[PDB]
Amino acid sequence: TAYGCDITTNAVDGFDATIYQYNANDLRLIRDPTFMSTGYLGRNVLNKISGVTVPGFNIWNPSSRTATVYGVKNVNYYNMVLELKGYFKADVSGDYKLTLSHIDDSSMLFFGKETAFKCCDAGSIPLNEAPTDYSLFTIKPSNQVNSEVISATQYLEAGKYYPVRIVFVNALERARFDFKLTIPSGAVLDDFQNYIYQFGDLDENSCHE
Amino acid sequence: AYGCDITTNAVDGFDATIYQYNANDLRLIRDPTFMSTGYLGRNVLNKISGVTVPGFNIWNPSSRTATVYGVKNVNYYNMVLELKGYFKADVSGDYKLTLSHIDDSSMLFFGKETAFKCCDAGSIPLNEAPTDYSLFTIKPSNQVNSEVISATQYLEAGKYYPVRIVFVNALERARFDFKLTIPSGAVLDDFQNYIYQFGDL
Numbered sequence: 001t002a003y004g005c006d007i008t009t010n011a012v013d014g015f016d017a018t019i020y021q022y023n024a025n026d027l028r029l030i031r032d033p034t035f036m037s038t039g040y041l042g043r044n045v046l047n048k049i050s051g052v053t054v055p056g057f058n059i060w061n062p063s064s065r066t067a068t069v070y071g072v073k074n075v076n077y078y079n080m081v082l083e084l085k086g087y088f089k090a091d092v093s094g095d096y097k098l099t100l101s102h103i104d105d106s107s108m109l110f111f112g113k114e115t116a117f118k119c120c121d122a123g124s125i126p127l128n129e130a131p132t133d134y135s136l137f138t139i140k141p142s143n144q145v146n147s148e149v150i151s152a153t154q155y156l157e158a159g160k161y162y163p164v165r166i167v168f169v170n171a172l173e174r175a176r177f178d179f180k181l182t183i184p185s186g187a188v189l190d191d192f193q194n195y196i197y198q199f200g201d202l203d204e205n206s207c208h209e
Numbered sequence: 210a211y212g213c214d215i216t217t218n219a220v221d222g223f224d225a226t227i228y229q230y231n232a233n234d235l236r237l238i239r240d241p242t243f244m245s246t247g248y249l250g251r252n253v254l255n256k257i258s259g260v261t262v263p264g265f266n267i268w269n270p271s272s273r274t275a276t277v278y279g280v281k282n283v284n285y286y287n288m289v290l291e292l293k294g295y296f297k298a299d300v301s302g303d304y305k306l307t308l309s310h311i312d313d314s315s316m317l318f319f320g321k322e323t324a325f326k327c328c329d330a331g332s333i334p335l336n337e338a339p340t341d342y343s344l345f346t347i348k349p350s351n352q353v354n355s356e357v358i359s360a361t362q363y364l365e366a367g368k369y370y371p372v373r374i375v376f377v378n379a380l381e382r383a384r385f386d387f388k389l390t391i392p393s394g395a396v397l398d399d400f401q402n403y404i405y406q407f408g409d410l
């Protein structure tokens with residue numbers, strides 16, 4: 001029933017990133033839609049990183065299988081699964097486009113309908129989460145250029161929040177994750193600050209007095 | 210081999226297969242297994258070849274049937290449609306496929322170039338091509354689907370890329386808006402000379 005709240009002081013910036021183990025040189029699972037949507041969740045977690053507003057990167061170090069990713073040293077970029085999750089807030093009403101470009105090796109994106117909220121004294125609690133059906137799935141052909149640029153545009157309402165999940169896999173060597181936002185003005189952004197949020201948990205016993 | 214000298218068995222247009230779908234089933238339209246493979250188990254209602262203009266937008270408040278792809282009395286109100294073919298252009302460059310405002314749902318698959326067995330009477334696509342990308346769009350129950358979903362890729366002149374589009378109408382309006390943008394920037398509704406089949410020999 002409520003798609004917004006007066007008190008949203010518990011909203012904080014950024015995607016939450018989870019990095020999972022992935023077998024080096026596996027060019028099969030990157031094309032497997034079940035693996036990209038759910039199967040990856042069974043792998044060992046390597047890192048958890050919050051506060052991420054600039055999600056894109058293009059990393060290749062011929063001399064190291066690790067690199068600094070999202071401010072964290074020694075991340076195993078060479079072979080990994082990355083999951084990014086959060087709530088996208090539309091500022092103004094209009095068509096917003098999410099674009100995945102030249103991905104190496106593969107990525108799948110999920111974008112949900114507007115979340116409802118429970119409104120509490122100390123903040124808002126989003127009720128909807130885990131959209132399960134993907135919109136976009138892009139895969140680099142083995143050993144050839146990824147010329148694919150794939151996008152999803154939809155109308156968003158000013159002030160409303162939409163859950164989003166992006167899954168990215170690097171099987172070996174270069175990790176290229178190019179993820180861009182086009183807002184209704186036509187501006188193209190690689191920085192999601194003031195558009196991407198988490199909602200802090202609160203004590204549901206004291207939601208109201 | 211990604212091409213052959215003799216391709217005299219190639220003909221134009223998508224091949225359409227229309228399958229039975231239960232009216233008012235708003236569950237399977239959002240089931241990715243159903244949209245990718247499950248539909249293939251349903252009863253076939255129509256087979257239509259030579260489909261050149263694949264898009265349509267049909268709603269008759271007084272009838273559950275309509276003319277689709279020149280065929281009278283197609284059960285548009287509740288159906289699965291599968292379009293398949295091989296995409297080819299003779300001009301290398303960026304091509305975009307776009308699905309818009311789909312009612313009720315659609316899933317699109319685009320494969321890498323197919324290899325061939327070249328024979329005296331024609332070419333045989335080996336058609337085990339790994340997927341390049343896929344798109345999935347679903348209309349929400351309470352509103353027009355605002356989604357416009359597209360894929361652009363650089364395609365090579367003379368290469369054949371398998372393409373498959375699955376569309377479902379669960380009830381009422383069947384909106385399947387599917388367009389091609391070619392390297393010149395022109396936006397086309399007609400796919401005739403961009404989509405091919407290979408005849409059995």
Ligand SMILES: CC(=O)N[C@@H]1[C@@H](O)[C@H](O)[C@@H](CO)O[C@H]1O
Pocket residue numbers: 060104105140141142143144171172173174175
């Ligand atoms: C240095 C480089 O570009 N390596 C890419 C690699 O990232 C990709 O995972 C692999 C399989 O497509 O193909 C290689 O050419």
Ligand SMILES: CC(=O)N[C@@H]1[C@@H](O)[C@H](O)[C@@H](CO)O[C@H]1O
Pocket residue numbers: 268312313348349350351352379380381382383
């Ligand atoms: C006339 C019309 O647009 N009817 C639509 C129908 O096509 C759609 O399948 C259904 C479920 O989303 O919602 C109805 O409002």
Ligand SMILES: [Ca+2]
Pocket residue numbers: 104105170171172173174175176
């Ligand atoms: Ca790679």
Ligand SMILES: [Ca+2]
Pocket residue numbers: 312313378379380381382383384
């Ligand atoms: Ca419908």
Ligand code: NA
Pocket residue numbers: 102145146147
């Ligand atoms: Na490139």
Ligand code: NA
Pocket residue numbers: 269270271
């Ligand atoms: Na009528």
Ligand code: NA
Pocket residue numbers: 396397398399
């Ligand atoms: Na046309």
